Design an enzyme around this catalytic site. Structure first.
Site, PDB file in Angstrom:
ATOM      1  N   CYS A   1      46.930 111.057  21.675  1.00  0.00           N
ATOM      2  CA  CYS A   1      46.490 112.387  21.120  1.00  0.00           C
ATOM      3  C   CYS A   1      45.226 112.396  20.883  1.00  0.00           C
ATOM      4  O   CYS A   1      44.556 113.448  20.432  1.00  0.00           O
ATOM      5  CB  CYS A   1      47.297 112.478  19.668  1.00  0.00           C
ATOM      6  SG  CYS A   1      47.161 111.126  18.492  1.00  0.00           S
TER       7      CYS A   1
ATOM      8  N   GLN B   1      50.130 115.407  26.602  1.00  0.00           N
ATOM      9  CA  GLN B   1      49.950 114.302  26.631  1.00  0.00           C
ATOM     10  C   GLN B   1      50.936 113.069  27.160  1.00  0.00           C
ATOM     11  O   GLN B   1      50.748 111.866  27.567  1.00  0.00           O
ATOM     12  CB  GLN B   1      49.501 113.572  25.253  1.00  0.00           C
ATOM     13  CG  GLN B   1      50.916 113.616  24.402  1.00  0.00           C
ATOM     14  CD  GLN B   1      50.331 113.222  22.963  1.00  0.00           C
ATOM     15  OE1 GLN B   1      49.628 113.893  22.199  1.00  0.00           O
ATOM     16  NE2 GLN B   1      50.605 111.941  22.335  1.00  0.00           N
TER      17      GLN B   1
ATOM     18  N   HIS C   1      49.104 111.353  13.606  1.00  0.00           N
ATOM     19  CA  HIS C   1      48.815 112.120  14.947  1.00  0.00           C
ATOM     20  C   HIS C   1      47.531 112.776  14.798  1.00  0.00           C
ATOM     21  O   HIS C   1      46.908 113.134  13.620  1.00  0.00           O
ATOM     22  CB  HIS C   1      49.780 113.128  14.837  1.00  0.00           C
ATOM     23  CG  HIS C   1      50.099 113.754  16.188  1.00  0.00           C
ATOM     24  ND1 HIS C   1      49.959 113.527  17.432  1.00  0.00           N
ATOM     25  CD2 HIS C   1      50.032 115.088  16.599  1.00  0.00           C
ATOM     26  CE1 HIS C   1      49.881 114.374  18.319  1.00  0.00           C
ATOM     27  NE2 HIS C   1      50.151 115.742  17.763  1.00  0.00           N
TER      28      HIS C   1
ATOM     29  N   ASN D   1      47.905 121.610  19.549  1.00  0.00           N
ATOM     30  CA  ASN D   1      48.658 120.391  19.653  1.00  0.00           C
ATOM     31  C   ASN D   1      48.695 120.049  21.181  1.00  0.00           C
ATOM     32  O   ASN D   1      48.096 120.746  21.922  1.00  0.00           O
ATOM     33  CB  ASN D   1      50.189 120.384  18.907  1.00  0.00           C
ATOM     34  CG  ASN D   1      50.845 119.100  18.816  1.00  0.00           C
ATOM     35  OD1 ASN D   1      50.081 118.049  19.278  1.00  0.00           O
ATOM     36  ND2 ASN D   1      51.943 119.158  18.260  1.00  0.00           N
TER      37      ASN D   1
HETATM   38  C1  LIG Z   1      48.685 110.111  19.372  1.00  0.00           C
HETATM   39  N1  LIG Z   1      49.572 110.505  20.199  1.00  0.00           N
HETATM   40  C2  LIG Z   1      48.724 108.795  18.615  1.00  0.00           C
HETATM   41  N2  LIG Z   1      49.718 107.712  19.242  1.00  0.00           N
HETATM   42  C3  LIG Z   1      49.672 106.632  18.519  1.00  0.00           C
HETATM   43  C4  LIG Z   1      48.905 106.184  17.509  1.00  0.00           C
HETATM   44  C5  LIG Z   1      48.475 105.009  16.707  1.00  0.00           C
HETATM   45  C6  LIG Z   1      47.792 105.436  15.786  1.00  0.00           C
HETATM   46  C7  LIG Z   1      47.138 104.348  14.961  1.00  0.00           C
HETATM   47  C8  LIG Z   1      45.679 103.745  15.596  1.00  0.00           C
HETATM   48  C9  LIG Z   1      45.992 102.685  16.314  1.00  0.00           C
HETATM   49  C10 LIG Z   1      44.693 102.088  16.844  1.00  0.00           C
HETATM   50  C11 LIG Z   1      43.321 102.470  16.611  1.00  0.00           C
HETATM   51  N3  LIG Z   1      42.243 101.787  17.249  1.00  0.00           N
HETATM   52  C12 LIG Z   1      42.148 100.507  17.502  1.00  0.00           C
HETATM   53  C13 LIG Z   1      41.973  99.304  16.448  1.00  0.00           C
HETATM   54  N4  LIG Z   1      40.878  99.761  15.851  1.00  0.00           N
HETATM   55  C14 LIG Z   1      40.557  98.700  14.623  1.00  0.00           C
HETATM   56  C15 LIG Z   1      40.760 100.930  15.018  1.00  0.00           C
HETATM   57  C16 LIG Z   1      40.734 102.125  16.183  1.00  0.00           C
HETATM   58  C17 LIG Z   1      43.126 103.417  15.680  1.00  0.00           C
HETATM   59  C18 LIG Z   1      44.477 104.130  14.971  1.00  0.00           C
HETATM   60  N5  LIG Z   1      47.296 106.827  16.118  1.00  0.00           N
HETATM   61  C19 LIG Z   1      46.107 107.272  15.207  1.00  0.00           C
HETATM   62  C20 LIG Z   1      46.989 108.161  14.082  1.00  0.00           C
HETATM   63  C21 LIG Z   1      45.806 108.903  13.328  1.00  0.00           C
HETATM   64  C22 LIG Z   1      44.759 109.981  14.028  1.00  0.00           C
HETATM   65  C23 LIG Z   1      44.230 108.982  15.043  1.00  0.00           C
HETATM   66  C24 LIG Z   1      45.326 108.268  16.262  1.00  0.00           C
HETATM   67  C25 LIG Z   1      47.963 107.287  17.251  1.00  0.00           C
HETATM   68  N6  LIG Z   1      47.797 108.559  17.460  1.00  0.00           N
END
Ligand SMILES: *[C@@H](N)c1ncc2cc(Cc3ccc(N4CCN(C)CC4)cc3)n(C3CCCCC3)c2n1
Length: 216
Positions: A26, A20, A163, A183
């Site tokens: 992810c 990635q 993640h 992964n």
């Molecule tokens: C994987 N490489 C990765 N990188 C960065 C991450 C940040 C987050 C937390 C996150 C940010 C934004 C959202 N969306 C936009 C706002 N709405 C309200 C909700 C959805 C969701 C989550 N993650 C997550 C961690 C947990 C698993 C899913 C990804 C990141 N993942």
């Protein structure tokens, strides 16, 4: 009864491990991985789907800033399709949505979520449905530098999901039950891009707290 061991890599339901890059996509690779499994199961064909299509077009998510897999599946359903990797190549950076029906390679009819913290339910889904998208706490140095064996660290926090990966099977290694996890940090990470994570050890690292799979 459900099999005591399942490995979708051997059944030809899993595409090669990807990298990635610096983009927090992810969630896109996790989603694509689940769709790739269902596509193979339904059409008998295995092919790389486009995580970039998801990064650039799922407005409900934050592109390289993060997002949920459920939102990704919802997009594919409403959009009536997702492009193949060949048609919409991965760049690792957010750019304007360039989805095109001509490169459509799969569709989605919805998704289902695994009850929170239920590893037995996750086991059923992996066994009867196929690869499942899951979220975990991958913040520990022990996870970062994993090399072999069944991963288990008392410091993993099931409430600290940071993640997203893909569960492509489950089994046993030297008496220890585990989940086979794909992964998206390249083939040079872990064991050729994979990690075996403790199964039935009180939802270690939150493996069953945010799991879901697409309906096809
Ligand atoms: C994987 N490489 C990765 N990188 C960065 C991450 C940040 C987050 C937390 C996150 C940010 C934004 C959202 N969306 C936009 C706002 N709405 C309200 C909700 C959805 C969701 C989550 N993650 C997550 C961690 C947990 C698993 C899913 C990804 C990141 N993942």
């Amino acid at each position: 009864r459900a099999p005591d061991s399942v490995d979708y890599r051997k059944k030809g339901y899993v595409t090669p491990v990807k990298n990635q890059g610096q983009c927090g996509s992810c969630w896109a690779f996790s989603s694509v991985g689940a769709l790739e499994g269902q596509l193979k199961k339904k059409t008998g064909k295995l092919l790389n789907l486009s995580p970039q299509n998801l990064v650039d077009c799922v407005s409900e998510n934050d592109g390289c800033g993060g997002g949920y897999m459920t939102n990704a599946f919802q997009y594919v359903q409403k959009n009536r399709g997702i492009d193949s990797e060949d048609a919409y190549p991965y760049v690792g950076q957010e750019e304007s949505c360039m989805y095109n029906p001509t490169g459509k390679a799969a569709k989605c009819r919805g998704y289902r979520e695994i009850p929170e913290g239920n590893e037995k339910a996750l086991k059923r889904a992996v066994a009867r449905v196929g690869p499942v998208s899951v979220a975990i706490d991958a913040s520990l140095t022990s996870f970062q530098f994993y090399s072999k064996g069944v991963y288990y660290d008392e410091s993993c926090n099931s409430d600290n999901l940071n993640h997203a990966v893909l569960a492509v099977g489950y089994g046993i290694q030297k008496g220890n039950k585990h989940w086979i996890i794909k992964n998206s940090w390249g083939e040079n990470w872990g064991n050729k891009g994979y990690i075996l994570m403790a199964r039935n050890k009180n939802n270690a690292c939150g493996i069953a707290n945010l799991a879901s799979f697409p309906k096809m």
